[PDB]
Scaffold this active site. Structure first.
Site, short mmCIF file in Angstrom:
data_model
loop_
_atom_site.label_atom_id
_atom_site.label_comp_id
_atom_site.label_asym_id
_atom_site.label_seq_id
_atom_site.Cartn_x
_atom_site.Cartn_y
_atom_site.Cartn_z
N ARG D 17 -7.87 -3.43 -23.69
CA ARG D 17 -9.14 -3.13 -24.36
C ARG D 17 -10.02 -2.13 -23.60
N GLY D 18 -11.06 -1.65 -24.28
CA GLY D 18 -12.01 -0.73 -23.70
C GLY D 18 -11.30 0.43 -23.03
N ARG D 39 -4.55 -11.13 -20.28
CA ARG D 39 -4.43 -12.58 -20.12
C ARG D 39 -4.96 -13.39 -21.31
NH1 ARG D 39 -9.32 -13.85 -15.86
NH2 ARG D 39 -10.54 -12.00 -16.45
N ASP D 53 -3.24 -12.71 -14.23
CA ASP D 53 -4.58 -12.82 -13.67
C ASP D 53 -4.45 -12.22 -12.28
OD1 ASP D 53 -7.11 -15.42 -13.50
OD2 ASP D 53 -6.97 -13.65 -12.33
N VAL D 54 -5.14 -11.11 -12.03
CA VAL D 54 -5.00 -10.38 -10.76
C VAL D 54 -5.57 -11.12 -9.54
CG1 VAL D 54 -4.95 -8.12 -11.91
CG2 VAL D 54 -7.12 -8.96 -10.98
N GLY D 82 -11.02 -5.60 -14.03
CA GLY D 82 -12.21 -6.09 -13.37
C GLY D 82 -13.20 -6.78 -14.28
N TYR D 145 -20.67 -6.16 -7.71
CA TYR D 145 -19.95 -5.07 -8.36
C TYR D 145 -19.86 -3.81 -7.50
CZ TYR D 145 -18.04 -2.41 -12.24
OH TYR D 145 -17.21 -1.66 -13.04
N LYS D 149 -16.53 -1.98 -5.96
CA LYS D 149 -16.13 -0.62 -6.32
C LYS D 149 -16.21 0.35 -5.15
CE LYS D 149 -14.95 -1.95 -10.41
NZ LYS D 149 -13.61 -1.65 -11.06
N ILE D 178 -19.95 4.46 -19.86
CA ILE D 178 -18.95 4.75 -20.89
C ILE D 178 -19.15 3.79 -22.06
CG2 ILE D 178 -16.49 4.93 -21.40
CD1 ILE D 178 -17.48 6.92 -19.29
#
Ligand SMILES: NC(=O)c1ccc[n+]([C@@H]2O[C@H](COP(=O)([O-])OP(=O)(O)OC[C@H]3O[C@@H](n4cnc5c(N)ncnc54)[C@H](OP(=O)(O)O)[C@@H]3O)[C@@H](O)[C@H]2O)c1
Ligand SMILES: NC(=O)c1ccc[n+]([C@@H]2O[C@H](COP(=O)([O-])OP(=O)(O)OC[C@H]3O[C@@H](n4cnc5c(N)ncnc54)[C@H](OP(=O)(O)O)[C@@H]3O)[C@@H](O)[C@H]2O)c1
Ligand SMILES: [Cs+]
Ligand SMILES: [Cs+]
Ligand SMILES: [Cs+]
Ligand SMILES: [Cs+]
Ligand SMILES: [Cs+]
Ligand SMILES: [Cs+]
Ligand SMILES: [Cs+]
Ligand SMILES: [Cs+]
Lengths: 226, 239, 239, 226
Positions: D17-18, D39, D53-54, D82, D145, D149, D178
């Site tokens: 997605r996205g 997932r 799941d990372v 993320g 966040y 990053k 975005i």
């Protein structure tokens, strides 16, 4: 036009040896009230010591409380506490990565968060994180260390954008190689702990009031780049 | 341990007014021997003045010689001499561009190059260039000014890479919006408008810039070379 | 979805040899209408050549007019025209400094400023400046070159801040050590010596620089403005 | 002189997605063999999907294995997976900080580490991490966040310095806003997922071979600074 000195209540995490000890002793000579954290090894003579493992949010809570009772709420926080566990990426384990992240990055978060309330309410705070040239320079075999030290930059800048309006700044000191390889260093020598401590002294002083979100390299030019 | 203070021979270009004067007064109160350049108006009481236009390489040479004779060869050089000729790119002339480049960037070169021999020979030098947040942040209508101030960073880094081995360092101080006569001459539209981009939510003072220069001129600054230190309340954060 | 290709009117300054020629050939193979500047030698087959010295503002004007008449006004400008006059700072002359500044930095200004009206008016512009790792990395003996290449970053960012709203972007490509005739003219002491500082452990090719320019001239690059893209095998990493 | 196209085996984490979906579909249109992780929600039509799941190193292991069986060892890894959990610093919890660090930063480590062996041995690898303008720009209320990053930048540069000699590069794409605030953006508009995907397309191509350790902002100029 030099602003008058103010004796600040200082907490240096990992302030019992190497660079942290040099910072602690310098800030004490500057005229501040200096507390340090440690865990087992003990604090240096003269300075107030508190036992904290920065991976323990509750232990971080009662360290700050213990410091507040001894010398007033932390006005200057120097987040030095860390460690490495180097390996080739392919050789590097989930455990090795997470242990360095938890101590160096999340540990910095724990102390910054705990510090924030009192600094915001008293409209004064200086958060000074001891990072590393590795963060943005990229030393091989430290994917964990470099992630942690670059992460503290991001963390500090988010905090700076939120809290600078309250006179609560957040800055990073990024030491290079410090005697506690030479081909990569323009000065053609390693730095001393006192050379790191002198920059922290500056950031904890009344002269650093309009610096926020900065990364100050103390590395003899090693880390220059983009 | 705090290193013992050393009284250094200091030259501050554009040290007769504004930020440069704040710097020069602070460095003199610190205990240094402070000289300032000017273009005729003179230097204020308690500062040795030398007349020079930093677009004139011969005048730069003579200014350094007059400083050397008065107080010893220049050990700490603060290159502050600056000007702007703002315009939309579309509007900007070769004349406006080259004029700002010649004073701000080539002028910084002229004083750095004149300083270097003596600093290298004596194995001590501190070159401190007063840059701008604009250099890497991008302020609009400042193609010339931004080019000059980014240019001094490049210049300072090449110098640091070359001469840091001789205990001659080169650093940049990059002020954001500082309250001067010129910032406080434009109407409140651009001034209040600028506060929106500053996390501190206030303008900086000349003293806050001077305080950073004092640090960089001190013995505590020995292992900093090629750094850009922003004094901007957080304005310039980014990549 | 991959945006449909548009054939753009391209000017590459210094596009008659070396990296500039590699860029110009790639852009022409991509489907663009490619013109190159030169200083007499000519442009190679399959490229429209216009003679200009980028230190001459009047010649820059006439070059753009000859391009507009041939293939339409310049939509994609690649400013590559460069030179160096390396020396120790102590050794470097005002002449060596100003010469490199005028060609590399003011010359970049001249071509950017001449391009801007038409790009703003048509609401499309891609200015791509070929910079250098040296700008922010600091190579020794390059005070002039480093100042020029850091300067173009400042310039490009001021332009991006101003004109990005009009779909006119400004980006920099910062090559590291690229195998040219001049890099492969010095003895193996400086060449092997440079490999030590490059994580890729090899020199780059003109095509690898050209490939990045192709991307920045394409429709995929529309939301990149004010970027410095290093093409250096990792050499320039830092802050 | 454009290098011939090579169909690479691609893994895009969070590719359902996205932005991740836009990258996945673009790389598929480019001619690559594209796998995605997810997932529960499922994969898009056409493309091979694997559940990961990372935060689970073992689940990351058997995803790569499953991909290797389907389309050959991952040659291009796009680490997109993320999430956020924004709060004022004083309001932010240890849990909120660690959950974002574990998914965004340690999760990036898990996939990069798992990818590294096969990329090193085949002397080809492209690791492309989807970062954020927030990392070095410092958006308020995202200490977690922004740390994550910025940390991926440090991580990528350490990897780049180690592995670039093996033709294994590591780069970060840093999107701004975005559409999946406008005052801070020179372009005076948000970007599209396709605008991020086009940059990843470039980094996964034969044209990006000499780019390593780079942070490429795709933000309409928002993130400019130092
Ligand atoms: P701040 O923001 O307060 O700075 P400011 O008020 O704009 O002042 C700029 C400083 O730089 C000096 N300066 C500008 N151009 C110069 C030139 N080319 N040669 C020598 N000095 C020059 C000025 O000296 P003068 O204007 O006195 O010449 C002045 O002291
Ligand atoms: P790369 O590393 O391969 O670059 P390079 O071989 O050094 O070539 C530099 C390029 O820039 C051009 N150039 C340099 N100075 C110029 C001037 N001031 N006016 C117009 N063009 C200029 C050169 O054109 P010319 O040398 O043909 O004039 C040449 O094409
Ligand atoms: Cs004391
Ligand atoms: Cs003292
Ligand atoms: Cs004095
Ligand atoms: Cs004093
Ligand atoms: Cs063509
Ligand atoms: Cs083609
Ligand atoms: Cs396909
Ligand atoms: Cs296609």
């Amino acid at each position: 036009a030099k602003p008058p000195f103010v004796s600040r209540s200082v907490l240096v995490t990992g302030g019992n040896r190497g660079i942290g000890l040099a910072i602690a002793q310098r800030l004490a000579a500057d005229g501040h009230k200096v507390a340090v954290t440690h865990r087992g090894s003990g604090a240096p003579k003269g300075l107030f010591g508190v036992e904290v493992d920065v991976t323990d949010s509750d232990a971080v809570d009662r360290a700050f409380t213990a410091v507040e009772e001894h010398q007033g709420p932390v006005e200057v926080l120097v987040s030095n506490a860390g460690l490495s566990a180097d390996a080739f990426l392919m050789r590097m384990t989930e455990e090795k990565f997470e242990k360095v992240i938890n101590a160096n990055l999340t540990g910095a978060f724990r102390v910054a968060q705990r510090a924030s309330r009192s600094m915001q309410r008293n409209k004064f705070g200086r958060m000074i994180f001891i990072g590393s040239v590795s963060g943005l320079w990229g030393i091989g075999n430290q994917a964990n260390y470099a992630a942690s030290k670059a992460g503290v930059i991001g963390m500090a800048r988010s905090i700076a954008r939120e809290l600078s309006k309250a006179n609560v700044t957040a800055n990073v000191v990024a030491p290079g190689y410090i005697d506690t390889a030479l081909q990569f260093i323009p000065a053609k020598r390693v730095g001393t702990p006192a050379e790191v401590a002198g920059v922290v002294s500056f950031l904890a002083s009344e002269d650093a009031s309009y610096i926020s979100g900065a990364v100050i390299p103390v590395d003899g030019g090693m880390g220059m780049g983009h």
